[PDB]
């Protein structure tokens, strides 16, 4: 019943004081885009940076299987928007946070479905 848990390992390494994964590929963009979390072209808004998706995927970057049973990557070949305040560790951010299935924003960093 053994599989390696890469997500936990990274989370624990960050808590031990480890340096975040680097060389996530930051894109040049207008920073007037939609703000959505994962998109086919950079969509950073004023408070976000856009990155090449593969370079922000723990599984891509560590040469290990994706958690999906099909192994499909939700980041590869797309662009992820990271809050500028969290751009020092994009891989950390994508790992820890979850995209709203409804509006397409990061839960807690854009999604307001839960209002009114």
């Amino acid at each position: 019943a053994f599989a390696v848990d890469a997500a936990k390992a990274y989370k624990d390494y960050l808590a031990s004081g480890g340096q975040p994964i680097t060389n996530c590929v930051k894109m040049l963009c207008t920073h007037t885009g939609t703000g959505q979390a994962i998109t086919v072209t950079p969509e950073a808004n004023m408070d976000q940076e856009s990155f090449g998706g593969a370079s922000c995927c723990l599984y891509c970057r560590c040469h290990i299987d994706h958690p999906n049973p099909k192994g499909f990557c939700d980041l590869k070949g797309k662009y992820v928007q990271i809050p500028t305040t969290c751009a020092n560790d994009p891989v950390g951010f994508t790992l820890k946070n979850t995209v709203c299935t409804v509006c397409g924003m990061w839960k807690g960093y854009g999604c307001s479905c839960d209002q009114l």
């Binding site: 680097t22 060389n23 996530c24 590929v25 930051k26 894109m27 040049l28 963009c29 207008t30 086919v40 072209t41 950079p42 940076e49 090449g52 998706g53 593969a54 370079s55 995927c57 891509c60 970057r61 040469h63 590869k76 070949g77 797309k78 662009y79 751009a87």
Partner: protein, 301 residues
């Protein structure tokens, strides 16, 4: 003057017409560096200015465009240029990349190994190459036309570039090839493009625009590289990152360029005119299939 606000500088036509001899390249701003926007890699900037420059040419841009990108791995194991190409190309553009060493990419398919191990039966609408071996930087031995990957690249163009397709091939003072310059005259137009962010380098991208399958003009590639170095040596380019801040017109305009399947007989002057104007691509539109040759060996004794 205004060059600083461009993405870069193309070799002016009068320099192409010269017959200079090859000199060592001596750039006055060698060593100087452009001021990149906060946190932006040199290679993202460089590919961005290249794509900005390509937006000014007559690129064919069909539906279900096919682009292949050689030398796309970096020393950090990711593919910055590929990320820029994919941002630039229309959504859904088939994008394949390759490099000698393993790397993580946003390309639809990635092939690792020497470029000569790469085979496809499909034609391509756009070939991009950043292949470069830095050992070919020795200033203590003659600067001869180089082979290796450039020989593969010349063959890949003649064999696998659709008519009306375009190319951008990275060269430097010592990383260059005479036949590739010659092949530039098999396009409707060509240039050597220096990005403003890397203007302190002898790097340029040899750009062939709208491939015609045949010589339109005759180019001696040894002479032309000498003309290129002559241009570089006498036209200092001011390092600039200015164009990187205005991304509003960056996306490649999806032209819906027409695709036809034709034989070598059916290529008349009307066709050639449309090829030359970026309004036609000639290739099949089958499914795209690539493969990587694998050497098989058993070392146990």
């Amino acid at each position: 003057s205004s060059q600083a606000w461009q993405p870069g500088v193309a070799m002016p036509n009068l320099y192409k017409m010269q017959r200079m001899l090859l000199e060592k390249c001596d750039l006055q701003n060698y060593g100087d560096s452009a001021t990149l926007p906060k946190g932006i890699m040199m290679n993202v900037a460089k590919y961005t200015q290249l794509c900005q420059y390509l937006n000014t040419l007559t690129l064919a841009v069909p539906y279900n465009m096919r682009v292949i990108h050689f030398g796309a791995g970096s020393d950090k194991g990711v593919a910055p240029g590929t990320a820029v190409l994919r941002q630039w190309l229309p959504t859904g553009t088939l994008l394949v990349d390759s490099d000698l060493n393993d790397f993580v990419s946003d390309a639809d398919s990635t092939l690792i190994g020497d470029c000569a191990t790469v085979h496809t039966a499909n034609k391509w609408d756009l070939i991009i190459s950043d292949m470069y071996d830095p050992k070919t930087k020795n200033v203590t031995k003659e600067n001869d036309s180089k082979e290796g990957f450039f020989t593969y690249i010349c063959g890949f163009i003649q064999q696998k570039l659709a008519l009306g397709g375009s190319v951008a091939i990275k060269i430097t003072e010592h990383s260059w090839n005479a036949d590739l310059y010659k092949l530039m005259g098999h396009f409707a137009w060509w240039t050597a493009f220096v990005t403003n962010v890397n203007a302190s380098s002898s790097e340029a991208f040899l750009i062939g625009c709208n491939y015609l399958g045949k010589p339109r003009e005759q180019i001696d590639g040894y002479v032309m590289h000498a003309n290129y170095i002559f241009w570089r040596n006498t036209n200092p380019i001011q390092l600039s990152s200015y164009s990187l801040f205005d991304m509003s017109k960056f996306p490649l305009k999806l032209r819906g360029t027409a695709v036809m399947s034709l034989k070598e007989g059916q290529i008349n002057d009307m066709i050639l005119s449309l090829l030359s104007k970026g309004r036609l691509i000639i290739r099949e539109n089958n499914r795209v299939v690539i493969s990587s040759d694998v050497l098989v060996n058993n070392e146990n004794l």
